[PDB]
Design a protein around this nucleic acid. Structure first.
Ligand SMILES: [Mg+2]
Ligand SMILES: [Mg+2]
Ligand SMILES: [Mg+2]
Ligand SMILES: [Mg+2]
Ligand SMILES: [Mg+2]
Ligand SMILES: [Mg+2]
Lengths: 58, 49, 40, 161, 133, 350, 183, 182, 137, 48
RNA sequence: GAUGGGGUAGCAGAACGUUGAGUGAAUCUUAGAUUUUUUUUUUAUAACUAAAUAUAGAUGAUAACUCAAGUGAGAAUGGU
C-alpha cells in the first residue's frame, strides 16, 4: 500500500493498494486536474444537507 | 536602579522593600529619590555647540 | 568600615530599627519604589 | 573498546542451544520450554471452563511433590454458648481477659476472639497510644526502616514487588 | 507449492493457540526479533517509502511462542504466517565529527556524518490456519 | 491600522459571538488538515467537524456545541468497549472492570487521543478564533454532560461521614465508570486543579463528538471501526490494575467454591536463606495441580505473591486475543452466534 | 527489545552454589577412564570454573560492568587436589616495596598457616578481571577445610534436594512436568 | 513569600585568602550566633565583620521587615504550649526553631576589590618587586527561619518520594540481540 | 478482596489500528527583497502547489518575512518544532527539505543504539536460575 | 499577504481581545508607546 | 544497478569567514531593528528557531552580487 505522493517530474501519484492488484498520476495546471479535493468540492459537500444514512445502517 | 526597583515591586508584591528608609549610595552619596545639586540646578558647563 | 563617622542617613535607620522592634510602628510594604500602572 | 562495534563483540552472548539446531530441510516445530517464570496469562488447565475447547494434553505428551510450607487446618472448638461467655468476660475486665487469655482458655485462634467480641473504646484507644508512645522512642534510623517494612508490604499487594 | 510437513500441520494450531507470539523478520538479510506493536528503527534509509506505507514482511527465520518454536530451513513458508509493518517516517542522528590526525602534524581532517534511519511499526503478526492447506 | 490590515476578513460583530460562524469553517486550513488527518470520509462536511470542536462552556446554545454529539459518542465508545472487555476477559472483577473501562474511554486516555490528533486549544472562546481550535471556557464551574446514573440520596453522608457505597449498586445508581453523579472576568491568575479537570473534560467531549458525527453521517458500522482503530488499539496491562487484600484467604474461598481440594503452599526452590536478599519460590498446589507460583525475599511474602499469581490467572482468563463480539451479529449476515462464557462472579471472602 | 522487557528480579539474584574439592569431577578431570581413575578438579581447573561463577559469566544476562555474580561455597579444601610436586615445590612470593623484605612460602607451608582455602583464593584471585569488582567477587568465594560451613541452608535447593545431593535431578524434573499443564 | 536581604560590605583592608575563612565561619549561623563569634575572634577583620553584620541587620529589619515577629511567636510557644518546629540543615545540624522570623546568614561569599596600594620589595642584587596591597569585600544574604523550615520539608519529601529499598530489584539488561539466549 | 487501582491508563501505539502523520503544520517564510530567497520564491510557485496537494493532512502557511533568510518551520503533534534555513537553495532543494520535515518526527535526534523498541513483555520470560534444569558447579 | 506579527498570532488564538481590556484597564499602551517621551535626563545635562 | 576514497615534503582545484567599499537618497524595525548568552534545527569552519534581559527610528542592522586587503594564531626562551 502506497500513500499519495508528489513526484517532481511526473505528477501527483494517487494512493495504490497492491493487495487488490494502478499508479494513476494526474498532472495539470489546476487543482481539479490533480485529482485532489479543492475548496469548491468542500462547498458542494457542505450544501448537501439532504444526504442521510439509511435507518437500518444508522 | 529603576530597572531593578521595578522588577522587585513586580515580584515581591506585599514584601516590597521600603527603599526610602535605606542608607545612601556610596558611589554618589545621594539618598533615595533625590537628585544632586549639580544635576538639579543644571550647573554643569556645556560645549559651545 | 568600623571607623567611618556615622552620617545622618545611618542615624535615622537606627531610630527606625528600635521603633519597629519595640513595636511602636508596624512595618508595611514600600509604596514609592516604582510608579507602576498595575498597582499590585 | 574503541568503537561501539568492538564493544558489541566483547559483550556477546550466544543464543540458546535449542535455536542453533536449524533444520537443513523443511520446517519443524520444536518444543523449547524456557527456563523462566511464566506469566499469569498462561491459565492452568484447572482454571479453564469445561466449555473452553483448548484443554490439550501437556505439550510433552504431544511429541513426589515438593516440601510442604503452609498446610493449615481449621478447627471449631467454640460452641454458640461459649461465644456469649467471651462477650461477657471481655466487656467485664478487658485487662485480665485479653484475647490471649481467652484464646488459650477456649483453644481458639487469637483472631477469632476478635471476630466475636471487641474491647471497649477506652481500652482500644489505650492500645493505640501504647504503640504510639513506642513509635516515638525510635530514632531516625529505626523509624525509616520501620516505614520501609510497611511500604514493602503495601507494594507487594499492589503487584509492585 | 511444496506441501508443508505433516508434523508442522498438527502442531501449528498448538503454536497459534498460546497467548503471545514473536517472530524474527529479515530485512535485507539482517534479523530483527519483533512482536506486534514493536518499533523497528532500521540502520538505513529505505528508498521509495513515505509515512503511511504498508510493508508486507515475507522472510521470517523464526516464529515461536513461549514453549513452541517454528523454524524454517532457509526461512519459514510465507503461507503459514502474516506479518505487516507500516512506515512511520525517517529519523536522524546528531551530527558527529571524526577528527583524523597524526602525531606531530598540524593538519586535522574533519569528517561530518549525519545518517538517516527509517522507523517501522509491526502492526500485524498472526499465524494462519493451515487446515485447508 | 492602515499599515496592518486584518489577516482574516471578518464583520465587526465577530469578536462578540460565542463561537465562529458555520461558514467560517470553510476557509480555515486547520480544519481541512484535521479532517484529512483522521482519514474521515467525505460524508462528514467541514461545518460538522467544526461543531465538534466547540465545547458547551464556550457556547450555551444546544446547537453549535458538543453537548449532543459528545453524548451520542460516549454511548457508542462505552458500549463497544464494555462488550469487548467482557468477551476478552469474562471473569474480571467488577471494580477492575470499572477501572479498565475508565482506562480506555475515560477522560485521561481521551485527552491523549485528542493530543495525538494535533488538536490545539484556543486561549479564550470567541467568534474571532479560527474554527480549527478546540475552544472551551475553563473558568465556568457548572459545565457537565447528561448521564444515565442517578444521584444517591446519601451522597452528602458518604463524603462527609465516610459511609459505605458498595460495588453492586454502582452499576445502576452511578455512572459508567462507577463514579457518583453530582459529586467581568479577570485573567490575572494561574492554573487550578479545577481548570485542569475542565481541560480534560473538553478534550474528552471532543473525541466523543467526533464519534458522534461519524455515527450520524457514516452510520453505525463506521463508528465501530473508528473506535476499534483509535481507542481499542491502545495497550493496557490489566494485570497492573489488581490490588489484593488477604489474597491467601481469597484463594482458599475460590478452591472451596469450585470444589477444588484445599490449596497447599510448597517450597519449590530456595537459596540464600539466612542472608540479606534470600530467594524463596513457593508454589500453591491444589492436590497435584499447580495453580500459581511466586518468588519473594520473605517466606510469607513469597506465599502471598504466589496466591496473587494464582488469583490473577483465574480472573485474567481469556478465551482469545481477538474474540467475537455480540455486536458483530446486527451487521450484514455473519456466521451464527455461539454462546459466550458467563462467569459466576468474583469470590467474596473474609 | 521484547526479550528484555519483564521482571529480571531472579536473573540478578545471588545463588549459593556448592562444590567439594574432593568429589571426583568427570567434566573437570583430565583422567576420563577408567571410572575409578577419575580425579577431582585440580586447583587451577577448579579455580577457573569458580572464577566463571563469581563473574556471572554463566548467566544469559552477563555484563562485565554489572555485578551479577553468584556465591560459591567450597568445602573439603584440605584435600585440594594437585598434580606433580606443586605442593612442596610451588612458591608464593610477596614484597612490601622494601629491599630485602621478600617473603617466600611453599604451598604445603601456606596450607599449614592458613589452610587450603588460602591457596584456592590466591588462584581464583588471579583469574578475575583486575578492577574495582575484584574484591567483591573474590569475597563471594567461601572456602572451608572440612565438611562443615554456616551456609548449609543457603545452598540452592529444588524441591527440598540440595543441588549436588544424591537425588536432586529427579526432584528438578518432577517440578517441570507440573509446569507444562497450562496454556 | 520569603524575605531576603543581600548586603555587600565596604572595602575591607585584607585579602581573600584571609577573609574567606571569616565568611565560612558565620555561614549558616544566626545573626546573633554570628555576632558572638566576631566579638570573641582573634582576627583583626572580625571587628569589621561585626560592624557590617549590624548594618545588614538594620537594613533587613527596616527596609525588608525581617525579624519583626518575635512577640507574636513567643505567645504560641508559651501561651499555648505549642510544640516548636524541629528541622535539620543541609549540613546535618539539628535545630529547634521557636521563632520563624529569626534572621540568619543564609549565604556568604568574599570578593576582591581594587588595589589598596603598592609596596616595593628591595632584595639583593639591586632587584625590586611590586607588592600589591589588597582590599576585599564580603556579601551576606540574610533570610528568615521560614526558608530553612521550607527547605527541610523539601528534603524530607524528596526522601519519602524515592520509594523504599527492595531486596530483589528489577535491574535493566542493556544489551539487545536479535535472538533469545534462554 | 480485590481492589481496583485507578491510576493507570492505556498507552497508544501510533501505526497500529490507525496512523497519524506527525507533521501537522508547515510554515513557509519567504522574502521578496532578500536575494537569498530567490529559490524559495521559485519553490512556492512550481513545487509547493503540488506538494501541498499531495499532503492534505498538513497545514501550509505562506507568509512573507523581509530582511530575513527563508525558513521551513514544521510544527509537530508532540509540540516540538523544527526550522530549516533554506537560504541560497534551488527550488528542488527546498522540496527535498520539505520532505525531510514531513517524514521526520518532533523528537530530538539521537544516536543509533537499538533497532527494536518494545513495551510488551517477553513471550519467553526473562531467565531465572530457578525455573530451569539446574546447574552443578 | 503581510508578515504575521505576535499580535496576529494572539488574535488567531483569541487571547488578544482579552489583552486589550487588561492593558486598557491598567492605562497601559495597546499597540504603541503612549504619550510618554524619550529619556531626557542625560540629554538635559549636555550629553553628546 | 558507472568508477574512485591513508598520507609528510610538495603541486593543484573549490569554498567559508574577518575588515572596508559600490548597488544604497535601497530593504526592514515598539506589531521589537539590535542585544558577546542560552536553546533549537539544517551535512554545519556556517547560519537558523525559540527563550530570557535591556530599549533603538538612525552616527542602527541587513540579503544578494561585486570590489580592495593592515583578512583568519595552542606554538618564534616572541611582545603588551
Ligand atoms: Mg586486564
Ligand atoms: Mg644596590
Ligand atoms: Mg583506502
Ligand atoms: Mg585524500
Ligand atoms: Mg541576545
Ligand atoms: Mg606566544
Amino acid at each position: 500500500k502506497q500513500v499519495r505522493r508528489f513526484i517532481p517530474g511526473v505528477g501527483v501519484q494517487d494512493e495504490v493498494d497492491f493487495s487488490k492488484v494502478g499508479a494513476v498520476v494526474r498532472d495539470g495546471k489546476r487543482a481539479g486536474d490533480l485529482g485532489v479535493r479543492t475548496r469548491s468540492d468542500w462547498e458542494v459537500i457542505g450544501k448537501m444537507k439532504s444526504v442521510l444514512p439509511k435507518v437500518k445502517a444508522l | 536602579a529603576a530597572v531593578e526597583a521595578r522588577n522587585e515591586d513586580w515580584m515581591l508584591g506585599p514584601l516590597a522593600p521600603r527603599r526610602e528608609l535605606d542608607e545612601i549610595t556610596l558611589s554618589n552619596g545621594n539618598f533615595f529619590g533625590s537628585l544632586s545639586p549639580t544635576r538639579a540646578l543644571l550647573e554643569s558647563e556645556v560645549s559651545e555647540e | 568600615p568600623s571607623q567611618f563617622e556615622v552620617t545622618k542617613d545611618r542615624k535615622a535607620i537606627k531610630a527606625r530599627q528600635s521603633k519597629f522592634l519595640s513595636g511602636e510602628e508596624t512595618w508595611a510594604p514600600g509604596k514609592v519604589n516604582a510608579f507602576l500602572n498595575s498597582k499590585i | 573498546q574503541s568503537t561501539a562495534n568492538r564493544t558489541k563483540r566483547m559483550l556477546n552472548i550466544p543464543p540458546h542451544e535449542s535455536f542453533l539446531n536449524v533444520p537443513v530441510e523443511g520446517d519443524r516445530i520444536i518444543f523449547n520450554p524456557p527456563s523462566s517464570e511464566a506469566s499469569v496469562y498462561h491459565t492452568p488447565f484447572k482454571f479453564l471452563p469445561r466449555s473452553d475447547p483448548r484443554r490439550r494434553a501437556n505439550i510433552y505428551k504431544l511429541f513426589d511433590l515438593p516440601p510442604v510450607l503452609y498446610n493449615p487446618t481449621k478447627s471449631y472448638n467454640v460452641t454458640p454458648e461459649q461465644v456469649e461467655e467471651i462477650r461477657e468476660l471481655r466487656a467485664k475486665d478487658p485487662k485480665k481477659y485479653s484475647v490471649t487469655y481467652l484464646s488459650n482458655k477456649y483453644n481458639c485462634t487469637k483472631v477469632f476472639i476478635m471476630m466475636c467480641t471487641q474491647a471497649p473504646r477506652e481500652h482500644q484507644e489505650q492500645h493505640k497510644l501504647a504503640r504510639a508512645r513506642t513509635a516515638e522512642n525510635w530514632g531516625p534510623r529505626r523509624a525509616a526502616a520501620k516505614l520501609d517494612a510497611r511500604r514493602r508490604k503495601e507494594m507487594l499487594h499492589r503487584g509492585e514487588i | 507449492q511444496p506441501p508443508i510437513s505433516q508434523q508442522v500441520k498438527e502442531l501449528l494450531p498448538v503454536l497459534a493457540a498460546q497467548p503471545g507470539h514473536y517472530t524474527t523478520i529479515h530485512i535485507h538479510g539482517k534479523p530483527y526479533l519483533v512482536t506486534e506493536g514493536d518499533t523497528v528503527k532500521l540502520p538505513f534509509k529505505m528508498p521509495g517509502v513515505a509515512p503511511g506505507d504498508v510493508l508486507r514482511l515475507n522472510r521470517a527465520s523464526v516464529i515461536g511462542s513461549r514453549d513452541l518454536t517454528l523454524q524454517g530451513a532457509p526461512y519459514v513458508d510465507e503461507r503459514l504466517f502474516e506479518c505487516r509493518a507500516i512506515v512511520m517516517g525517517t529519523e536522524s542522528e546528531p551530527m558527529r565529527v571524526m577528527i583524523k590526525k597524526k602525531r606531530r602534524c598540524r593538519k586535522k581532517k574533519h569528517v561530518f556524518s549525519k545518517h538517516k534511519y527509517t522507523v517501522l511499526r509491526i502492526n500485524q503478526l498472526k499465524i494462519n490456519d493451515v487446515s485447508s492447506l | 491600522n492602515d499599515r496592518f490590515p486584518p489577516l482574516e476578513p471578518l464583520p465587526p460583530a465577530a469578536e462578540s459571538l460565542p463561537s465562529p460562524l458555520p461558514e467560517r469553517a470553510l476557509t480555515s486550513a486547520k480544519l481541512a488538515a484535521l479532517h484529512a488527518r483522521l482519514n474521515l470520509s467525505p460524508k462528514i462536511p467541514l461545518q460538522t467537524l467544526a461543531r465538534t470542536l466547540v465545547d458547551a462552556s464556550a457556547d450555551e446554545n444546544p446547537q453549535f456545541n458538543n453537548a449532543n454529539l459528545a453524548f451520542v459518542g460516549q454511548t457508542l465508545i462505552n458500549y463497544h468497549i464494555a462488550e469487548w472487555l467482557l468477551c476478552k476477559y469474562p471473569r474480571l472483577p467488577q471494580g477492575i472492570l470499572f477501572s479498565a473501562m475508565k482506562a480506555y474511554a475515560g477522560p485521561k486516555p481521551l485527552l491523549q487521543i485528542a493530543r495525538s490528533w494535533g488538536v490545539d486549544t484556543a486561549a479564550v472562546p470567541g467568534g474571532e478564533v479560527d474554527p480549527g481550535l478546540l475552544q472551551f471556557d475553563a473558568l465556568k464551574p457548572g459545565v457537565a454532560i447528561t448521564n444515565f446514573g442517578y444521584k444517591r440520596t446519601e451522597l452528602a453522608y458518604l463524603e462527609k461521614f465516610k459511609w459505605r457505597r458498595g460495588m453492586a449498586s454502582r452499576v445502576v445508581l452511578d455512572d459508567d465508570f462507577g463514579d457518583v453523579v453530582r459529586s467581568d472576568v479577570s485573567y490575572d491568575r494561574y492554573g487550578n486543579p479545577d481548570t485542569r479537570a475542565a481541560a480534560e473534560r473538553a478534550h474528552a467531549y471532543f473525541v466523543r463528538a467526533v464519534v458522534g458525527a461519524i455515527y450520524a453521517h457514516c452510520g453505525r458500522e463506521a463508528a465501530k471501526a473508528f473506535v476499534k482503530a483509535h481507542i481499542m488499539s491502545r495497550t493496557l496491562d490489566i494485570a497492573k490494575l489488581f490490588e489484593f487484600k488477604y489474597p491467601t484467604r481469597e484463594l482458599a474461598a475460590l478452591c472451596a467454591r469450585e470444589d477444588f481440594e484445599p490449596p497447599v503452599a510448597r517450597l519449590l526452590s530456595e537459596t540464600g536463606r539466612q542472608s540479606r536478599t534470600p530467594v524463596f519460590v513457593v508454589g500453591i498446589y491444589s492436590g497435584s495441580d499447580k495453580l500459581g507460583e511466586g518468588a519473594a525475599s520473605s517466606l510469607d511474602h513469597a506465599r502471598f505473591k504466589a496466591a496473587m499469581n494464582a488469583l490473577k490467572a483465574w480472573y485474567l482468563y481469556s478465551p482469545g486475543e481477538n474474540p467475537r463480539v455480540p455486536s458483530d451479529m446486527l451487521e450484514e449476515g455473519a456466521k451464527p452466534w455461539t454462546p459466550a462464557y458467563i462467569d459466576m462472579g468474583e469470590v467474596i471472602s473474609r | 527489545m521484547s526479550q528484555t522487557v519483564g521482571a529480571t528480579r531472579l536473573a540478578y539474584s545471588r545463588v549459593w552454589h556448592h562444590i567439594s574439592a574432593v568429589t571426583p569431577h568427570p567434566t573437570l578431570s583430565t583422567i576420563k577412564a577408567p571410572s575409578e581413575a577419575i580425579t577431582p578438579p585440580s586447583l587451577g581447573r577448579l579455580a577457573s570454573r569458580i572464577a566463571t561463577i563469581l563473574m556471572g559469566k554463566h548467566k544469559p544476562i552477563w555484563d562485565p560492568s554489572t555485578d551479577c555474580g553468584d556465591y560459591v561455597v567450597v568445602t573439603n579444601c584440605a584435600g585440594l587436589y594437585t598434580t606433580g610436586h606443586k605442593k612442596w615445590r610451588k612458591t608464593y612470593y610477596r614484597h612490601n616495596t622494601r629491599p630485602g623484605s621478600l617473603q617466600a612460602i611453599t604451598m604445603d607451608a601456606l596450607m599449614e598457616k592458613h589452610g587450603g582455602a588460602e591457596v584456592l583464593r590466591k588462584a581464583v584471585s588471579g583469574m578475575l578481571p583486575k578492577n574495582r569488582l575484584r574484591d567483591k567477587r573474590l569475597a563471594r568465594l567461601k572456602a572451608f577445610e572440612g565438611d562443615a560451613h554456616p551456609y548449609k541452608e543457603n545452598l540452592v535447593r529444588f524441591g527440598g534436594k540440595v543441588v549436588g545431593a544424591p537425588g536432586w535431578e529427579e526432584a528438578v524434573k518432577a517440578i517441570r512436568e507440573a509446569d507444562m499443564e497450562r496454556l | 513569600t520569603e524575605r531576603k536581604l543581600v548586603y555587600k560590605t565596604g572595602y575591607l583592608p585584607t585579602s581573600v585568602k584571609k577573609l574567606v575563612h571569616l565568611s565560612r565561619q558565620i555561614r549558616g549561623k544566626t545573626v546573633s550566633e554570628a555576632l558572638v563569634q566576631m566579638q570573641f575572634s582573634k582576627k583583626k577583620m572580625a571587628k569589621e565583620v561585626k560592624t557590617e553584620l549590624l548594618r545588614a541587620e538594620a537594613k533587613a529589619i527596616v527596609t525588608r521587615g525581617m525579624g519583626l515577629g518575635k512577640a507574636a511567636a513567643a505567645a504560641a510557644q508559651k501561651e499555648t504550649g505549642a510544640e516548636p518546629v524541629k528541622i535539620q540543615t543541609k549540613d546535618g545540624k539539628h535545630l529547634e526553631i521557636r521563632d520563624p522570623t529569626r534572621i540568619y546568614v543564609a549565604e556568604t561569599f568574599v570578593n576582591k576589590g581594587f588595589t589598596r596600594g603598592v609596596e616595593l620589595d628591595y632584595r639583593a642584587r639591586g632587584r625590586v618587586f611590586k607588592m600589591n596591597k589588597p582590599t576585599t569585600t564580603m556579601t551576606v544574604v540574610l533570610k528568615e527561619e521560614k526558608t530553612r523550615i521550607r527547605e527541610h520539608q523539601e528534603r524530607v519529601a524528596k526522601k519519602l518520594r524515592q520509594g523504599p529499598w527492595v531486596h530483589l530489584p528489577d535491574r535493566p539488561v542493556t544489551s539487545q540481540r536479535q535472538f533469545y539466549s534462554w | 478482596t480485590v481492589k481496583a487501582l485507578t491510576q493507570i491508563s492505556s498507552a497508544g501505539r501510533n501505526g497500529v489500528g490507525a496512523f497519524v502523520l506527525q507533521c501537522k503544520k508547515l510554515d513557509i517564510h519567504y522574502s521578496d527583497w532578500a536575494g537569498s530567497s530567490r529559490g524559495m520564491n521559485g519553490f512556492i510557485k512550481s513545487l509547493l502547489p503540488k506538494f501541498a496537494a499531495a499532503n492534505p493532512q498538513i497545514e501550509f502557511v505562506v507568509s512573507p518575512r523581509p530582511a530575513k533568510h527563508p525558513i521551513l518551520m514544521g510544527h509537530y503533534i508532540n509540540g516540538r518544532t523544527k526550522a530549516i534555513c533554506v537560504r541560497n537553495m534551488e527550488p528542488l532543494e527546498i522540496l527535498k527539505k520539505a520532505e525531510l520535515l514531513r517524514d521526520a518526527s518532533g523528537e530530538k535526534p539521537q544516536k543509533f543504539k537499538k533497532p527494536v523498541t518494545s513495551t510488551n513483555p517477553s513471550v519467553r520470560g526473562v531467565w531465572s536460575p530457578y525455573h530451569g534444569q539446574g546447574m552443578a558447579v | 499577504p503581510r508578515r504575521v506579527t505576535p499580535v496576529d498570532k494572539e488574535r488567531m488564538v483569541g487571547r488578544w481581545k482579552v489583552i486589550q481590556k487588561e492593558l486598557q484597564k491598567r492605562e497601559l499602551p495597546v499597540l504603541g508607546t503612549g504619550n510618554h517621551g524619550k529619556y531626557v535626563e542625560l540629554k538635559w545635562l549636555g550629553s553628546k
